[PDB]
Design a protein around this ligand. Structure first.
Ligand SMILES: Cc1cc2nc3c(=O)[nH]c(=O)nc-3n(C[C@H](O)[C@H](O)[C@H](O)COP(=O)(O)O)c2cc1C
Ligand SMILES: Cc1nc(C)c(C(=O)Nc2ccc3ccccc3c2)s1
Ligand SMILES: O=C(O)c1cc(=O)[nH]c(=O)[nH]1
Length: 365
C-alpha cells in the first residue's frame, strides 16, 4: 500500500520531528475523533471474524487502552479499521496524572516509555460521553464492533477495591467488557493488587458489583496483567481466575524491565516500556497463561504488535483477540489494515480456515 510507505517514511517522522510525543498524541486523538483519517480500504473477510466474551468481533485487532483514555475518539477508531475499541484507563475522580514530561519515544527501538500516571477525566465525564452515543454503540456491537472500558484507581484512594467497584457501577452498564487494570507500573502500590490474596478480594467485589447489574447491561470482566510477573504470580492469578470465574485476561501491560540491547537515548527514563522490545515477553506470558488456564479463559494479547506475523504469533500462543497502540506512533493509521491483510494471508498459508482455528494452535503441536 502507498499509504503505508507515505505515513511510515514521511508523515509520522515529520509529526515526530515537529511535536513532543504528548502533543502529537493529543493531535492524533483530535484528528481521529473528527474522522480525519486516510482511506481504510481493507475489507474484513469472514475468516477474521471471532466469537468470544459473549460477542461477535468482525476482526481480532483492537486499539489498546491508553490511546483514547477518556472515550473521545471511539467512532473514529472503528473507522480506522479496529475490530473493537477499548477506552481508559478511567479513574473515579478526575486527576491530572504525573508532572511532564511523561512520555518518551525510542525510535531506534520502535518503543515508547510512558509514566502518565492515570491522567483521566474521571467516571462522570466519561459516563456522559458514552451515554451520548449509547444506542449507536449498541448497533456497532450487534454489528460485530464491541466496546471495552478499562478501569483504574485514583492516586489518593485508600480503598482500591471501592475505586474499581465504583467503575463497575458507573461504566459497567455502557461496556461490552470491563478491564480491571492492576498492572500499570505508574501508580504506587497498584501492581501489588496482582498478588493472590489482594486479587481474590478485589475481584470478588468487582464480580459481585457486576452481577448486580441488569442483564442487558452486564459486561464481561477481564483482568489486565503485567509482563513482569514471577512464575508464582502467574500460577496464583490463573488459580484465582478459575476460582472466581473471571471472564478473561488482557496480557500484557507495559514492562518496567529494560531488555538488554535498547539503543534509544531515553531508555533510562522511568516508566512502562512498550513496542517491539516488549513483543516476545508479552507473547511468552500469553503462552504461559493460556496453558495455566487450560485454554478455557479467553485472552486478549497485547504488546509490540506491528504486523500480521506479530498478531498471528500471539493468536497461536493462545490469544483470541489482539490489541496494539505503540505501532501507531511509528506507522500511523495504515498499520491497522496492514496487520489485518498480513494476518489473513498467513492464516491461509498455514492452513487455517480462520482466526478461530489458529487460537492456541501452538499448544496442540
Ligand atoms: C502512552 C501509553 C499509555 C497507556 N495507558 C494505558 C492505560 O491507561 N491503561 C492500560 O491498561 N494500559 C495502558 N497502556 C498500555 C497499552 O494498553 C498496552 O498494554 C502496551 O502499550 C503494550 O502494547 P503496545 O506495545 O502495542 O503499545 C498505555 C500504553 C502507552 C504507550
Ligand atoms: C485526510 C487527512 N487529513 C489529516 C489531518 C490526516 C492525518 O494526519 N491523520 C492522522 C495521522 C496520524 C495519526 C496517528 C495516530 C492516530 C490517528 C492519526 C491520524 S489524514
Ligand atoms: O497511565 C499510565 O501511566 C499507564 C497506565 C497503564 O496501565 N500502563 C501504562 O503503561 N501507563
Amino acid at each position: 500500500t502507498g499509504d503505508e510507505r507515505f505515513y511510515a517514511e514521511h508523515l509520522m517522522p515529520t509529526l515526530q520531528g515537529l511535536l513532543d510525543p504528548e502533543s502529537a498524541h493529543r493531535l492524533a486523538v483530535r484528528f481521529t475523533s473528527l474522522g480525519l483519517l486516510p482511506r481504510a480500504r481493507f475489507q474484513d473477510s469472514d475468516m477474521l471474524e471471532v466469537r468470544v466474551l459473549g460477542h461477535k468481533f468482525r476482526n481480532p485487532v483492537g486499539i489498546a487502552a491508553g490511546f483514547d483514555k477518556h472515550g473521545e475518539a471511539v467512532d473514529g477508531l472503528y473507522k480506522m479499521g479496529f475490530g473493537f475499541v477499548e477506552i481508559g484507563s478511567v479513574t473515579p475522580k478526575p486527576q491530572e496524572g504525573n508532572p511532564r514530561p511523561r512520555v518518551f519515544r525510542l525510535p531506534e527501538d520502535q518503543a515508547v516509555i510512558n509514566r502518565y500516571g492515570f491522567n483521566s477525566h474521571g467516571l462522570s465525564v466519561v459516563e456522559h460521553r458514552l451515554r451520548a452515543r449509547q444506542q449507536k454503540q449498541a448497533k456497532l456491537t450487534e454489528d460485530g464492533l464491541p466496546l471495552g472500558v478499562n478501569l483504574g484507581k485514583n492516586k489518593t484512594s485508600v480503598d482500591a477495591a471501592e475505586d474499581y467497584a465504583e467503575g463497575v457501577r458507573v461504566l459497567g452498564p455502557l461496556a461490552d467488557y470491563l478491564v480491571v487494570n492492576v498492572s500499570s507500573p505508574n501508580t504506587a502500590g497498584l501492581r501489588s493488587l496482582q498478588g493472590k490474596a489482594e486479587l481474590r478480594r478485589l475481584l470478588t467485589k468487582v464480580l459481585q458489583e457486576r452481577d448486580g447489574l441488569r442483564r442487558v447491561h452486564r459486561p464481561a470482566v477481564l483482568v489486565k496483567i503485567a509482563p513482569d510477573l514471577t512464575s508464582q504470580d502467574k500460577e496464583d492469578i490463573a488459580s484465582v481466575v478459575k476460582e472466581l470465574g473471571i471472564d478473561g485476561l488482557i496480557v500484557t501491560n507495559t514492562t518496567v524491565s529494560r531488555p538488554a540491547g535498547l539503543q534509544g537515548a531515553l531508555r533510562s527514563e522511568t516508566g512502562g516500556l512498550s513496542g517491539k522490545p516488549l513483543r516476545d515477553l508479552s507473547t511468552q506470558t500469553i503462552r504461559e497463561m493460556y496453558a495455566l488456564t487450560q485454554g478455557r479463559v479467553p485472552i486478549i494479547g497485547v504488546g509490540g504488535v506491528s504486523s500480521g506475523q506479530d498478531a498471528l504469533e500471539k493468536i497461536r500462543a493462545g490469544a483470541s483477540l489482539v490489541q496494539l497502540y505503540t505501532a501507531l506512533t511509528f506507522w500511523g493509521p495504515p498499520v491497522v489494515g496492514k496487520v489485518k491483510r498480513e494476518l489473513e494471508a498467513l492464516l491461509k498459508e498455514q492452513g487455517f480456515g480462520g482466526v478461530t482455528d489458529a487460537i492456541g494452535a501452538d499448544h496442540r503441536r
